[PDB]
Design a protein around this ligand. Structure first.
Ligand SMILES: CCCCCCCCCCCCCCCCCC(=O)OC[C@H](COP(=O)([O-])OCC(O)COP(=O)([O-])OC[C@@H](COC(=O)CCCCCCCCCCCCCCCCC)OC(=O)CCCCCCCCCCCCCCCCC)OC(=O)CCCCCCCCCCCCCCCCC
Ligand SMILES: CCCCCCCCCCCCCCCCCC(=O)OC[C@H](COP(=O)([O-])OCC(O)COP(=O)([O-])OC[C@@H](COC(=O)CCCCCCCCCCCCCCCCC)OC(=O)CCCCCCCCCCCCCCCCC)OC(=O)CCCCCCCCCCCCCCCCC
Ligand SMILES: CCCCCCCCCCCCCCCCCC(=O)OC[C@H](COP(=O)([O-])OCC(O)COP(=O)([O-])OC[C@@H](COC(=O)CCCCCCCCCCCCCCCCC)OC(=O)CCCCCCCCCCCCCCCCC)OC(=O)CCCCCCCCCCCCCCCCC
Ligand SMILES: CCCCCCCCCCCCCCCCCC(=O)OC[C@H](COP(=O)([O-])OCC(O)COP(=O)([O-])OC[C@@H](COC(=O)CCCCCCCCCCCCCCCCC)OC(=O)CCCCCCCCCCCCCCCCC)OC(=O)CCCCCCCCCCCCCCCCC
Ligand SMILES: CCCCCCCCCCCCCCCCCC(=O)OC[C@H](COP(=O)([O-])OCC[N+](C)(C)C)OC(=O)CCCCCCCCCCCCCCCCC
Ligand SMILES: CCCCCCCCCCCCCCCCCC(=O)OC[C@H](COP(=O)([O-])OCC[N+](C)(C)C)OC(=O)CCCCCCCCCCCCCCCCC
Ligand SMILES: CCCCCCCC/C=C/CCCCCCCC(=O)OC[C@H](COP(=O)(O)OCCN)OC(=O)CCCCCCC/C=C/CCCCCCCC
Ligand SMILES: CCCCCCCC/C=C\CCCCCCCC(=O)O[C@H](COC(=O)CCCCCCC/C=C/CCCCCCCC)COP(=O)(O)OCCN
Lengths: 35, 80, 129, 29, 65, 78, 135, 231, 62, 51, 43, 78, 78, 78, 78, 78, 78
C-alpha cells in the first residue's frame, strides 16, 4: 500500500470528541477518523 | 517510553482476552525489520539511514564543528 | 559504604544477566568457570588481530589509492559519498587546527617583542604560568 | 530600555499595523 | 565460579586512583603558589600607592601653601 | 546655598522594596491552592473545573507581582 | 472591465510549473499531513521531528546573525576606544593583537555580573594606563 | 524619522507557506471560549457576538509565533514595546466599545449605576458608576501592562540565569578533576533542574497570558450582550 | 501538541531517522562548544588587555 | 457557489473584510496611526546620541 | 498522492503499517502476552 | 544658615514603597479565588454566578493597585 | 551652630509610604468578596441583599483609599 | 552646585529587602501543605491528586521566590 | 564632583533584613503543624502519611529559609 | 575621590532587625498550641500523640529562632 | 581617606526594632487563648487539662519575648 495521507483529524480522538456521532463506529468499537 | 518530553505512542488493545487468546502468532509472515517485536524497543532492528554512520559519529561531527567555530580565528586571524 | 557496594554489584549482575547475546553469555560462563577475565582476553585478542592486520591495512590503503586515482570512485559518486567526504573534510580541518595549537604549544599566537601587548606579559600575576 | 522608548514608536508600530491590514487577510483566506 | 586468577580490574582502579591523587597534589601546589603570587602583587600595589603618596606629600611641602 | 546632589546607589534600595510586593503575591497564590485542596476534598467531581479556576486566579495574582518586578528592573537598570 | 475581481480569472495554464510544485507539495505534506500532527492554533505541531529539526536551525541562524552582525559592533567599539579611539589606530595593530583584545572582550561578556571586578576597575597602585591615557 | 526594519518571522512565514498550502483541520485552540458564548439552549443574540473569532485566532497565531519561539536563544520579540501593546489593545478594546456605543442604546448602560434604589443615588450609586467607568479603561490598561510585564520579566530572568550558568560551567568545570568535584556536580545538577523548570514555566505562562489577553476582550464584549429566549 | 512521531529508545537509535540525526548533530555542537570555551578562555597564554582600564561599558552606560 | 474568501482576489477580500466585517477596527487603527505619525515621529540629535 | 511515492515509508510509518495492517491481531496478541509476562515477572 | 539640598536619587525609594502596596492587592485576589474554589464545591449549580462576582472583586481590587502603580510612574519619571 | 536645611526630595518617600496604606484596602476588599461568595452559596436566595451590603463595604474601604491618595498627592505636589 | 556621589555599601541594603520577599513565599508554601493535610484527612482516598496539586502550587510559589532571589544575588554583585 | 564613599557598617543592615525572612518561614512551620494536629484528630488512621507530608512541607519551607540565610551570612562576613 | 567611612553604631541596627524574625517564630508557636487545644478537645484520646507532634513543631520553629538569635548576637558583639 | 565615626543615638533605634518582636509574641498568646475558649466551649469537661497546655504555650512564647527583651536592654545600656 502507498504512503499517502488520509482525511485530516487534527490530532483528535473521535471516540470522545463533541462530534463523535458523525464518525461511524466499526465492529471493534473504534470510531472512524473520517465520514 | 520517553526521550526528554517526547513520549512513544502506544496502540490501545482492541481485542478482548477471549478473542485474543484464540489468535495464532506466526512471526514468519512478519517483516524482518519487526521480529521479536518489543514495545519498549521497536526500532532495535530498524536499518540505519546511512550504512556505517553511527549516532556517536554525528555527535562528534557536531563537536568538531563547534571546535572549528571557536578555534578557527586562533589559527587564521583577520584584521578589523 | 558496604550497602552501596552491594547495591551496585547487584545492579551490574542484573544488567549482565539481562543481555541476550549467546556469544557474550558463553564467554562469561567459560571465564567464570576458568576464573579468568573475559574483558582482558578480548583486549588481547583485538591487539593480536590488529598486529596481524597491519600489512592488510597497508595493502588496503594502496588498493583504495588506486581506486580513487583511477577515477572509478567518482564514477559512482552519490549523495552518501558527499556526506562522508564532508565529514572527512571537517575532521581534517579540526585536526589541522589542533596540530597548530600543539605545534606552537599555546592556544593563542605568541606576542612579538615589538607588539604593545608585551606589557601584559610583564604584568603577569604569576610569572611561573 | 527601548521597550519604554518612543523616539521611533511610529515605525515600530508599523509592523503590527501591516500585520493587521495586509497579512491577516492572507492568513484568513 | 572459581576464584579469580588475576586482579586486573582492581589494578586498573588503583592506577586511576593513584593518578587522581597525584593530580590533586599538583592542583593544591599550584593553587597555593597562585595565592602567594596574588598576595605579593597586592603588596606591590600597596607599596606603590604608599610611594606615590609620599611623593605627593613632598611635592605638597614644596608647594608650601 | 543651592547644592544639588545625585546619589547613584539609591536605585538598589528602591529595587529591593519592590521585591517585597512578591511576598503578598507568593502568599496569595498559596492561599488559592490551599482552598483548592480543601475544595477538591469536599467535591472531587469538580476537580478539573476547580483546577481551571485556580490557574486563572494564579495568573491574575501573578500578574501583579510582575508589575512590581518591572519597576525593580527599571530602577536596577537606570 | 480592466481587472477581474474573481480568482477564477486565470493568468497561466493549469500545467505551468506542475513538476516543481508537486515536489514542493510532496516536501510539505510528507511530515505535516498526518493524524499525529495536530497543531495548537497552527503554531505548535504534534510531530516531534519538526521540533527536533527546526529548533537547531533557528538557533543556528540567529546565533550566526548575532555573532557576525550585532556583537561585532560592541567588539569593534571596545577595540577602537581602548586602542587609540580611531579605526586607523586599531588597524595599526596586528591580527594577533586584535584576536587577543576580542577574546578579552569575550571574557568580559562571560563574566558579566558574576565575576571579578578588576577587569574594569583599576586597583589603586596599578601601573597600567588609565582613562586619560589618550587624552 | 523613518526607520526601516523587519520582523523576525520570515522563516516562520516560509514554514507557514510550505505546510499550509494544503488544508488541515484545527481542533486545539488556545482560547476556545470565543466560539461558545452561549451555554443554555434556546438563547440567541441579535448582536454580532461571533465577530471576535477571526481577530482572536489571528492574534493568538501572531503572539504565539513571537512569544513561544522567543524561548530559543537570540530570538527577538520585535513588538516588545509598552506603547505598541497599548496601541494594539486600544484598537481592539475601543473598537468593540465604539461598536456598542454606536448602537445608540443608552439603556445598555443602566447597569453602570450600581446598587438598588435603596442606596443613596448621589453619594453611593453615582460614585460607583464613576468607579466602574474608570474600571473599564483600567481593565484595558491592566491587560496591556500584564502582557508586557510577563514577557519582560521572564526573559530578564532567563538571560540572567543563562549568564550565571555559562560562567560557572566555563570557569569552574575544572573542579570535576579536583577534590571538590562533588560541590560542582551538585551545583551543575541544580542549574540543570532550574533550567528545565524555567523553560517549562515560561512555556506555560506564555499560553496562559494569551488566554487571559483574549478573555479580557471577550469579557468586555459579554458585559454588554443581551440574550433573547426562543418561543 | 506533542502527539506522536519517531522516538529513539536510546542514543544508538538517533541514526535511524534523518531528523534525529540532525538533532544529535546539533546537540553535539551545543555540548562541545562548552569544552572549547573552557580550553580557549582558561588558557595559560591568555592575557588581559593592558588598556582594559582605559574604557569600559560601565562608564559609557553610566 | 460564491464566497468572498474563495472567489474574490486578495485586494477585494481585504477591502470587504475591513469595510463590511471590521470597519470600526480599521477606523480606530487609522486614527492611531495618524496620532503616532503626528506626535511620535521625531527624534532629536541628543536623543539619537543617547539611545 | 502519486508525487509522494518516491519518498517511501520511514520507520514510524512502517511500524504503523505493521501494527495496524492485516497482521494487527497477531501483533496485538504478541505484545499483550509479552507485557503480561513482564508484569508477572516484575511481581 | 539657609541651605537648600536636592537629592536626586530619592524618587527610587518612593517608587519602591508604592510598589509594596501591590502585596495587599495580590493577597486579596488570592483570598477571593480561594473563597470561590471552596464555595463552588458547596453550590456547584451556581458556579457561573459566583465567577461573575469574583471577577467584579478583581476589577474593584486591581484598580487600587493601579493608583499605587500610577504614583510609581509619576515619581519614577520625575 | 544653627543650620537650616531644606531637602527637596523627601516628599517622594512620604508619597510612597502613604501609598502603602492601599495594601490594607485591597486586602479588605478581597476579604469582603471572599465572604460574599461563601455567603451566596450558603443562602443563594439572598444574593441581591448580600451584593448590596458588599458594595457598601467596598465603598467605605474605597473612601479610606481616597483619603490616603489625597495625602499622597498633596505631598507629591506640595 | 552639581555634586555626584556614589555610595558603595547600599547594595547590601537592597539585597536584604529582596530577601524579605521570601517570607511570604515560605509562609505560602506552609499554608498549602497545611491545607493539604486537612483535605487528605477529610478525603483520604485522594492522597495523590492532592499531592500533585500541592507540588504544582509549591513550584509556582517557588518561582516567585526565585524571581526575587535573582535580584537579591544580582544587586549583591553590582 | 565625583565622590566615592564606602560605609563599613551597612553590611550589618542588609544582614538583619535577610534574617527577617526567617519569620515567614518559622510561621509557615507552625501552620503546617497547626493543621497536622487537626488532620490527625479528624483521621487518626493516617497519622503516618500525614506526618511524612508535613515533614516534606517543613523541609521545603526550611529550604527557603536557608536560601535567605545564605545571603545573611555572606553579607555579614563581606 | 576615594573615601572610606566606618559607622560604628550600625551594628546595633542589624541586631534589632534580626530580633523581628522572632515575631513570626513566637506567633508560629501560638498557632501550634492553638490548634492543639482544638485537636485535643475534638479527640481527647490522642492527647499524647498530638502533644508530641506539638513539641516537634515547637523545636523546629525554635531552631529558626536560634538562627536569627545567632545573627543578632554576632552583629551585637562584632 | 579613612574616617571612623561613632554615632551614640543609634542604640536607641536598635532597641525599638527588638521591641517589635513582642508584637509577634503578644499576638501569639492571644491566638492560644482564642482557641482555648473554643476548645473549652466544645467539650468543657477537659478545661482543667487544656488550661495546663495553654499555660505551656504561654511559657514558650513568653520565653522568646525575653530574648528580644534581652537585646532591647543590652543595646539600651551599652
Ligand atoms: C606536560 C607533559 C607531561 C608528560 C609526563 C609523562 C607522560 C608519560 C610518558 C611515559 C611514562 C612511562 C609509561 C607510563 C604508562 C602508565 C599508563 C599505562 O601503562 O597504563 C596501562 C594500565 C593497564 O596496564 P596493565 O595492567 O598491564 O593491563 C593489563 C591488560 O592489558 C588490561 O586490559 P583491559 O582489557 O583491562 O584494557 C582496558 C584498560 C587498559 O586501558 C588503557 O590502556 C588506558 C590508557 C592507558 C594510558 C593511561 C595513561 C594515564 C596517564 C595520566 C592521565 C593522562 C590522560 C589519559 C587519558 C586516557 C583516555 C582513555 O583500561 C584501563 O586501564 C582502565 C583505567 C580506568 C579505570 C576507571 C575506573 C574508575 C572507577 C572510579 C570509582 C570511584 C568510586 C568512588 C566512591 C566513593 C564513595 C565514598 O592502565 C592504567 O594504568 C590506566 C591509568 C588511567 C589513569 C587515568 C587518570 C585520569 C585523570 C584522573 C581522573 C580525573 C577525571 C575523573 C574524576 C572523577 C571523580 C573522582
Ligand atoms: C533611498 C534608498 C532606498 C529606500 C527608499 C525608501 C523610500 C521611503 C519613502 C518614505 C516612507 C516613509 C514611511 C516609512 C515607514 C517604514 C515602517 C517600516 O518599515 O515598518 C516595518 C514593517 C515591517 O513589516 P514586516 O512584518 O517585516 O513585513 C513586511 C515585509 O515586507 C514582508 O511582509 P509580507 O511577506 O507579508 O509581504 C507580502 C509578500 C509576500 O511574500 C512574498 O511575496 C515573498 C517575497 C517577500 C519580499 C519582501 C521582503 C523583503 C525582504 C528584504 C529585501 C529582499 C532582498 C532585496 C535585495 C536588495 C539589493 C540591494 O509579498 C511582497 O513583499 C510583494 C513584493 C514582491 C516583490 C517580488 C519582486 C520580484 C522581481 C523579479 C524580477 C525578475 C527579473 C528577471 C529579468 C531577466 C532578464 C533576462 O514594514 C512594513 O510594514 C512595510 C514598510 C514599507 C513602507 C513604504 C516604503 C515606501 C516604498 C519603498 C520602496 C523602495 C523601492 C526601491 C528600492 C531599490 C533598492 C535600493
Ligand atoms: C488565459 C491566459 C493563459 C496564459 C498562459 C501563460 C503561460 C506561461 C506563463 C506566463 C508568464 C508568467 C505570468 C506571471 C506569473 C507570475 C507568478 C505566478 O504564476 O503566480 C501564481 C499566480 C498564477 O496565476 P493563476 O493562479 O492562474 O491566477 C491567479 C488568480 O486568478 C488570482 O490570484 P490571487 O488573487 O489569489 O492572488 C494574487 C496575489 C494577490 O494580489 C496581488 O498581490 C496583486 C496586487 C499587488 C499590488 C502590489 C503593489 C502595490 C503598490 C502600491 C500602489 C501603487 C499605485 C500607483 C498608482 C500610480 C502612480 C503614478 O496573491 C499574492 O500576493 C500571493 C502570490 C505572490 C507570489 C510571490 C511573489 C514573489 C516571488 C519572488 C520570486 C523570486 C525571488 C527573488 C529571486 C532572486 C534570485 C537571485 O499568479 C498570481 O497569483 C499573481 C501574483 C501577482 C503579484 C504581483 C506583485 C507585484 C509586486 C511588484 C510590483 C512592482 C512595482 C514597481 C513600481 C515602480 C515605480 C517606480
Ligand atoms: C493623490 C492622493 C490624494 C491627494 C489628496 C486628495 C484630496 C484630500 C483627501 C483627504 C484628505 C484628508 C485631510 C485630513 C482629514 C482629517 C484627518 C487628519 O487630521 O489628517 C491629518 C493629516 C493630513 O493633514 P491635513 O489635516 O490635511 O493638513 C496638513 C497639516 O498642516 C499637517 O499638520 P499635522 O501636524 O497633522 O502634520 C503631521 C502629519 C501627520 O501625518 C500622518 O499622521 C500620516 C498618517 C498616514 C495615514 C494613512 C492612512 C491609510 C492607512 C492604510 C493602512 C496602512 C497599514 C500599515 C501599513 C504599513 C506598511 C506600509 O501630516 C502630514 O504631513 C500629512 C501627510 C499625509 C500623507 C499621506 C500619505 C499616505 C501614504 C499611505 C501609504 C500606504 C502604503 C501601503 C503599501 C501596501 C503595498 C502592498 O494626515 C492625514 O490626513 C493622513 C491620511 C491622508 C489620506 C489621503 C487620502 C488617501 C491616501 C492617498 C495616497 C496614497 C498613497 C499610496 C502610496 C503607496 C506607496 C507604495
Ligand atoms: C508544545 C510544547 C513544545 C515543547 C517543545 C520542547 C522541545 C525540547 C527541546 C530539547 C532541547 C533541544 C536542544 C536543541 C539544541 C540546538 C543547538 C544549540 O546549540 O542550541 C542551544 C540553545 C541555547 O543553549 P545555550 O543557552 O546553552 O547556548 C549556549 C551558547 N552560548 C554559550 C554562546 C551562549 O538551545 C535552546 O535555546 C533550546 C531551547 C528550546 C526551548 C523550547 C522551544 C519551544 C518553542 C519552539 C518550537 C518550534 C517548533 C517549530 C515547528 C514548525 C512550526 C510550523
Ligand atoms: C518619553 C515620554 C513618553 C510619553 C508617553 C505618553 C503616552 C503615549 C502613548 C502613545 C500610544 C497610545 C496611543 C493611543 C491613542 C491616543 C489617541 C489620542 O489621544 O489622539 C488624539 C489626537 C488629537 O489630535 P491633535 O493632537 O492633532 O489635536 C488637534 C487639537 N488642536 C488643533 C487644538 C491642537 O488625535 C490625533 O492625533 C488624530 C487626529 C486626526 C484623526 C481624527 C479626525 C477627526 C476629528 C473629529 C473631531 C474634530 C473635527 C470635527 C468633526 C469631524 C468633521 C469632518
Ligand atoms: C484600455 C486601453 C485603451 C487604449 C489602448 C491601449 C493599447 C495598448 C497596447 C496593448 C498591447 C498589449 C495587450 C495585451 C493584452 C492585454 C489584455 C488585458 O488587458 O488583460 C488584463 C490583464 C489582467 O487580466 P485579468 O484581470 O486576469 O482579467 C482579464 C479579463 N477580464 O492584465 C495584465 O496581465 C497586464 C497586461 C498589460 C498589457 C499592456 C497594457 C498597456 C496599456 C496602455 C494604456 C495607455 C495608452 C497606451 C497608448 C499606446 C500607443 C502606442
Ligand atoms: C595537550 C593536552 C593534554 C591533555 C592532558 C590533560 C590532563 C589534565 C589533568 C589535570 C586536570 C585538572 C587540572 C586542575 C587545574 C586547572 C586550572 C586551570 O584552569 O588551568 C588552565 C588549564 O585549563 C584548561 O585549559 C582546561 C580546562 C578544562 C578542559 C576540559 C577538557 C574537556 C572536558 C569535556 C567535558 C565534557 C563532559 C564530560 C563529563 C564527564 C564528567 C561528568 C591553565 O591556565 P592557568 O595557567 O591555570 O591560569 C589561567 C589564567 N590566565
Amino acid at each position: 500500500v502507498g504512503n499517502g495521507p488520509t482525511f485530516s483529524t487534527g490530532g483528535e480522538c473521535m471516540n470522545t470528541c463533541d462530534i463523535q456521532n458523525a464518525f461511524p463506529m466499526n465492529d471493534r468499537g473504534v470510531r472512524s477518523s473520517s465520514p | 517510553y520517553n526521550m526528554l518530553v517526547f513520549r512513544d505512542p502506544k496502540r490501545r488493545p482492541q481485542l478482548s482476552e477471549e478473542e485474543r487468546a484464540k489468535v495464532v502468532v506466526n512471526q514468519a509472515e512478519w517483516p524482518e525489520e519487526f521480529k521479536d517485536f518489543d514495545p519498549d524497543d521497536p526500532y532495535k532492528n530498524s536499518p540505519e539511514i546511512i550504512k556505517g554512520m553511527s549516532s556517536w559519529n554525528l555527535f562528534l561531527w557536531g563537536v568538531e564543528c563547534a571546535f572549528i567555530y571557536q578555534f578557527y580565528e586562533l589559527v587564521f586571524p583577520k584584521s578589523i | 559504604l558496604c550497602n552501596a557496594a552491594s547495591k551496585v554489584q547487584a545492579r551490574s549482575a542484573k544488567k549482565l544477566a539481562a543481555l541476550t547475546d549467546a556469544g557474550i553469555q558463553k564467554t562469561i560462563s567459560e571465564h567464570n568457570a576458568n576464573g579468568t577475565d573475559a574483558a582482558v582476553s578480548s583486549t588481547k585478542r583485538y591487539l593480536a588481530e590488529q598486529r596481524q592486520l597491519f600489512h592488510y591495512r597497508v595493502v588496503r590503503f594502496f588498493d583504495e589509492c588506486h581506486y580513487i586515482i583511477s577515477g572509478e570512485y567518482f564514477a559512482q559518486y552519490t549523495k552518501v559519498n558527499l556526506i562522508w567526504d564532508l565529514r572527512f573534510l571537517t575532521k581534517l580541518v579540526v585536526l589541522f587546527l589542533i596540530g597548530t595549537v600543539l605545534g606552537r604549544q599555546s592556544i593563542f599566537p605568541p606576542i612579538d617583542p615589538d607588539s604593545p601587548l608585551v606589557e601584559a606579559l610583564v604584568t603577569k600575576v604569576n610569572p611561573n604560568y | 530600555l527601548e521597550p519604554m522608548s518612543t523616539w521611533y514608536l511610529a515605525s515600530w508600530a508599523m509592523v503590527w499595523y501591516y500585520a493587521f491590514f495586509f497579512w491577516m487577510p492572507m492568513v484568513w483566506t | 565460579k572459581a576464584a579469580p586468577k588475576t586482579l586486573h580490574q582492581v589494578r586498573n582502579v588503583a592506577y586511576f586512583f593513584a593518578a587522581w591523587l597525584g593530580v590533586q597534589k599538583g592542583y593544591i601546589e599550584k593553587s597555593a603558589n597562585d595565592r602567594l603570587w596574588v598576595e605579593h602583587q597586592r603588596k606591590v600595589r600597596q607599596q606603590n600607592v604608599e610611594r606615590q603618596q609620599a611623593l605627593d606629600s613632598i611635592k605638597l611641602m614644596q608647594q608650601g601653601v | 546655598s543651592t547644592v544639588a546632589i545625585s546619589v547613584q546607589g539609591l536605585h538598589y534600595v528602591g529595587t529591593g522594596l519592590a521585591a517585597i510586593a512578591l511576598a503578598g503575591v507568593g502568599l496569595g497564590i498559596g492561599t488559592i491552592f490551599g482552598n483548592l485542596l480543601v475544595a477538591c476534598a469536599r467535591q472531587p467531581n469538580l476537580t478539573k473545573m476547580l483546577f481551571n479556576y485556580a490557574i486563572l486566579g494564579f495568573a491574575l495574582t501573578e500578574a501583579i507581582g510582575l508589575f512590581a518586578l518591572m519597576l525593580a528592573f527599571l530602577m536596577l537598570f537606570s | 472591465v480592466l481587472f477581474s475581481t474573481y480568482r477564477s480569472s486565470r493568468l497561466v495554464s493549469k500545467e505551468f510549473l506542475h513538476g516543481p510544485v508537486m515536489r514542493f507539495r510532496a516536501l510539505g505534506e510528507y511530515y505535516f499531513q498526518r493524524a499525529w500532527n495536530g497543531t495548537l492554533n497552527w503554531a505548535l505541531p504534534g510531530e516531534y521531528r519538526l521540533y527536533a529539526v527546526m529548533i537547531p536551525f533557528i538557533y543556528f541562524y540567529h546565533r550566526w546573525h548575532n555573532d557576525h552582525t550585532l556583537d561585532r559592533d560592541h567588539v569593534e567599539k571596545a577595540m577602537i576606544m581602548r586602542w587609540g579611539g580611531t579605526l586607523e589606530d586599531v588597524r595599526k595593530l596586528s591580527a594577533k593583537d586584535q584576536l587577543r583584545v576580542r577574546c578579552f572582550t569575550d571574557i568580559e561578556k562571560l563574566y558579566s555580573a558574576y565575576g571579578p571586578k578588576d577587569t574594569y576597575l583599576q586597583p589603586p597602585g596599578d601601573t597600567l594606563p588609565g582613562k586619560d591615557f589618550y587624552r | 524619522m523613518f526607520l526601516f526594519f523587519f520582523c523576525d518571522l520570515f522563516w516562520l512565514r516560509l514554514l507557514l507557506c510550505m505546510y499550509y498550502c494544503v488544508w488541515s483541520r484545527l481542533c486545539f485552540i488556545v482560547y476556545f471560549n470565543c466560539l461558545m458564548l452561549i451555554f443554555d439552549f434556546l438563547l440567541f443574540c441579535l448582536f454580532d457576538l461571533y465577530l471576535f473569532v477571526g481577530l482572536c485566532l489571528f492574534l493568538l497565531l501572531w503572539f504565539m509565533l513571537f512569544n513561544l519561539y522567543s524561548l530559543i536563544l537570540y530570538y527577538c520579540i520585535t513588538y516588545l514595546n509598552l506603547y505598541l501593546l497599548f496601541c494594539i489593545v486600544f484598537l481592539l478594546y475601543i473598537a468593540f466599545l465604539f461598536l456598542f456605543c454606536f448602537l445608540c442604546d443608552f439603556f445598555l448602560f443602566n447597569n453602570l449605576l450600581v446598587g438598588d434604589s435603596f442606596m443613596d443615588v448621589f453619594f453611593i450609586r453615582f460614585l460607583l458608576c464613576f468607579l466602574e467607568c474608570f474600571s473599564l479603561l483600567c481593565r484595558c490598561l491592566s491587560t496591556f501592562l500584564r502582557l508586557f510585564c510577563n514577557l519582560l520579566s521572564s526573559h530578564f530572568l532567563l538571560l540572567m540565569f543563562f549568564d550565571f550558568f555559562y560562567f560557572i560551567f566555563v570557569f569552574f568545570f575544572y573542579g570535576v578533576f579536583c577534590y571538590w568535584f562533588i560541590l560542582f556536580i551538585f551545583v551543575f545538577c541544580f542549574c540543570l533542574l532550574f533550567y528545565v523548570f524555567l523553560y517549562l514555566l515560561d512555556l506555560f505562562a506564555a499560553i496562559l497570558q494569551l488566554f487571559i489577553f483574549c478573555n479580557m476582550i471577550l469579557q468586555l464584549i459579554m458585559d454588554f450582550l443581551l440574550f433573547l429566549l426562543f418561543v | 501538541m506533542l502527539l506522536g512521531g519517531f522516538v529513539p529508545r536510546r542514543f544508538s537509535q538517533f541514526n535511524r531517522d534523518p531528523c534525529w540525526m540532525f538533532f544529535i548533530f546539533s546537540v553535539g555542537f551545543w555540548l562541545g562548544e562548552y569544552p572549547a570555551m573552557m580550553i580557549k578562555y582558561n588558557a595559560r597564554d591568555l592575557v588581559y588587555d593592558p588598556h582594559r582600564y582605559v574604557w569600559s561599558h560601565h562608564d559609557d552606560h553610566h | 457557489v460564491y464566497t468572498r474568501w474563495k472567489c474574490d482576489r486578495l485586494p477585494v477580500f481585504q477591502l470587504k473584510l475591513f469595510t463590511q466585517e471590521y470597519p470600526m477596527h480599521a477606523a480606530v487603527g487609522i486614527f492611531t496611526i495618524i496620532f503616532l505619525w503626528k506626535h511620535m515621529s521625531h527624534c532629536s540629535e541628543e536623543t539619537e546620541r543617547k539611545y | 498522492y502519486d508525487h509522494l511515492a518516491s519518498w517511501g515509508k520511514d520507520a514510524f510509518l512502517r511500524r504503523l503499517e505493521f501494527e495496524n495492517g492485516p497482521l494487527r491481531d497477531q501483533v496485538e496478541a504478541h505484545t499483550q502476552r509479552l507485557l503480561a509476562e513482564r508484569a508477572a515477572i516484575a511481581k
